[PDB]
Structure formats: C-alpha cells, structure tokens
Amino acid sequence: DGTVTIEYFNQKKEMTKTLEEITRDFEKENPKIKVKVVNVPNAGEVLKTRVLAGDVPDVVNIYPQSIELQEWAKAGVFEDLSNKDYLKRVKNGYAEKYAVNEKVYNVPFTANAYGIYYNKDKFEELGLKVPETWDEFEQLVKDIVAKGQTPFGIAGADAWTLNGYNQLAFATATGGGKEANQYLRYSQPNAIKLSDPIMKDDIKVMDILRINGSKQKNWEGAGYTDVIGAFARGDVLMTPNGSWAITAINEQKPNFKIGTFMIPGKEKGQSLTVGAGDLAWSISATTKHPKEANAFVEYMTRPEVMQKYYDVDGSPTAIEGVKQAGEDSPLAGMTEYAFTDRHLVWLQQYWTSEADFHTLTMNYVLTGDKQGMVNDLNAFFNPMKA
Ligand SMILES: OC[C@H]1O[C@H](OC[C@H]2O[C@H](OC[C@H]3O[C@H](OC[C@H]4O[C@H](O[C@]5(CO)O[C@H](CO)[C@@H](O)[C@@H]5O)[C@H](O)[C@@H](O)[C@@H]4O)[C@H](O)[C@@H](O)[C@H]3O)[C@H](O)[C@@H](O)[C@H]2O)[C@H](O)[C@@H](O)[C@H]1O
C-alpha cells in the first residue's frame, strides 16, 4: 500500500466539519499518511472501553484535567511529550498545568469556559442589564418573566449541561476552585449539611433556575440540541452552557447579536468561570506509527492551522501566533478571565467521577428537593473520602 493509517478519536462533536477539513489539509500535505476521524456518541465512555481493551487510538482527544488522563498517564498509556519542539508553541504554561509526575502527556490547544449565553438584542429591547450579583441575577429572571418572555433554556435530558453551573455555584459561594473542593471533596464524611451557609448559598444560586416560569415548556425531556435551537430561534433569552456551544448556535443562523456573562458572586466583582483543555490531544504509547501521530499533533500547533479551527470554535486558545477576537465577540463575557485565577479548573479533577454530580444537579431543578440534594452530595462524595 505504502500509505499508513492513524486514527484520531474526537470528542469535539460540534467541530466535526472543521476538524475533518483540517484533516484533509494534512492529508494533502502528507500523501503517505491517512487519518480516520472517529466521532461516536458518548465518546468518553467508549474511550474507557477502548483503553482497557488495549485498542488505544493513535491520537486521542482527552480532557487533561480528567482522572482518566491522570491514571492512564501513570500506567504508561500515553507518550511523553515533555521534550517535543512543537510544545513550545503552547503559551500560558498551559501544557505544564496538566503535568503528571512533572511530565506533559497532553497538548491542550484550547481552553473551554462556562457562563450564560444571552440575547443582546432583546436585552436592549426590554432594558435589561448583565447581572453582577446573585440578587441581580434573580431579579433579571423575574423581570423577563413579567415581560412575558422565557428567561432560560434548560436541557433536562442532558444533565451535563448544568455541570458548570453548580460547580460555579459552589465556587462563588466558597471563594474559588480550591475552596469549593475543600467543602465538597476534602471535607469529612457527612460534612455537607442543609444548615451550612455555603449550602444555603448553593441552593440560592440553583434556585435562580427554579424561579417561577424561568424555564421553557417541555424542558424536562429537552436535549442539548433542542436548547441550542430554542436559543437561536429566540424562544429563550438565556441558556447556561460551556463555550463549546457557540459554534453550534452560530450554525443555526440566529437573527440577533449573541453575548455572554459569567455567573456572578454574592457581591460585585466576585464572578468566576470554570473550564480546562477543550481541544486537547494525547498520543498512544503503543502506536504503530508514532512519527505520523506526532506529525498530526504538530500540524495542529501551527498558527495558520489553529486559526482555521479558532475562527469556527471561538474558545480561548493557548497556541502561539493566533489572532483572537475582541470584546465585541459572543464569548467576550464568558472568557473575560481566561487563563487566570478566576478561570478555575473543573472540580472533577480531584473526583473519581462526575456523572452523579450532573444527576443531583438536574434532579434539584426537577424536584426542588433541598434535603434530597444534600443527601445526594454526601452519597456521592463519601466513597471518595473513604
Ligand atoms: O461540563 C461538561 C464537560 O465539560 C468538559 O468537556 C468539554 C466538552 O463538553 C461537551 O461534551 C460533554 C460530554 O459529552 C459526552 O458525554 C455526554 C453524556 O453521555 C452519556 O449520557 C447518555 C447516556 O446514553 O449518552 C448520550 C450522549 O450522546 C445521551 O443521550 C445520554 O445522556 C453519559 O452517561 C453522560 O455522563 C455524559 O454526560 C462525552 O462522552 C464526554 O466525554 C463529554 O465530552 C462538549 O459537547 C464537548 O465539545 C466538549 O467541549 C470536561 O472536560 C468534562 O469532564 C465535563 O465536565
């Protein structure tokens, strides 16, 4: 044949079209290299299945904060990338941030963030402003309801959409990422109580989604795609989601200017965001073609290649020589403190899982069971403390 075939296991399902075009550009420059792009649903679970099966894809899209990356790096599943030349194209010391045993096993090209998408046009129409406190965010929702408009679009069927919301609910209440994990993860068993002021603050922030008439009709069984469309059409004024959503929203061709804002704290200037490596690649240590796999990763570190991805995606990049958008862009408010302290890492960096945290978050929006949520939190965190 002559040509060799490497596999790229993608999790960026929103960026399927652009990543394939970049792949074709690579294939045209490398005639002896063919790249198969894999896009399967529930890619995170399929990856667990494949790694254990010993069928590790050549290039793997894996989130570098995950416990999966940490465990598999120590096991020797991934190639050491510490002394690669293309790693010098990663600024903000972002590759070093997710080092395992002081060794880099992942190239995080982009960083995701979390906030609230909002309709700038209808905000101007109704004379609404971006909230700076919990109380203001409560009022904003109530003001929208009274105007006969739906504030939030919530994906009840996809609990992972509110992961960033609840994590920031704890973050803004406690002080930051470390402070949130001190209350939740590194506390004593059965420490989380309803009487705890931090918990009372958490409920308050979560109750913003529980305000009368805050959510759209038939939200309980609404998916991630459903809410993207609902926001794009202008059926809902806001939707809480990650920076990964904007490319899907843009594709729906909305007839309004899109904006974002961070989930605020108790008082002004206490707003935070959460995220980690979005487009983040690792190379299999057991690959038959390590030179070809490295050439694919190196290709993505190129500024003119990364620009092509960024122009569609929009999430902040750590790649050198990429012209990024200004404060006029949709993700301006959400990614305002990108690559700073106020951009804390996903809390599941020090958890054994996160799936149940999604469930108990959404379950509260469904039921409003305060004690039930507290019980869910203890049942989730206790096994980790043991
Ligand atoms: O906060 C969420 C997320 O943020 C970071 O990752 C960035 C990532 O975010 C999105 O993708 C999220 C997630 O998508 C997949 O998982 C979806 C769920 O899959 C299962 O659920 C079911 C059960 O059959 O499967 C289908 C989904 O196709 C659903 O019908 C049904 O709910 C699973 O049970 C559940 O736990 C999952 O949430 C994927 O497998 C994951 O790896 C993730 O990618 C964006 O779409 C994507 O572009 C990225 O930007 C962070 O790193 C994550 O840890 C997490 O915290």
From TrEMBL:
Organism: Streptococcus pneumoniae
Protein name as annotated: Extracellular solute-binding protein
Annotated PROSITE patterns: PROKAR_LIPOPROTEIN, SBP_BACTERIAL_1
CDD domains registered for this protein in UniProt: PBP2_XBP1_like
Family, as annotated: Belongs to the bacterial solute-binding protein 1 family.
UniProt-listed Gene3D superfamilies: Periplasmic binding protein-like II
Keyword annotations of the record: Cell membrane, Lipoprotein, Membrane, Palmitate, Signal, Transport
The keyword Transmembrane helix appears for this protein: no
Domain of life: Bacteria
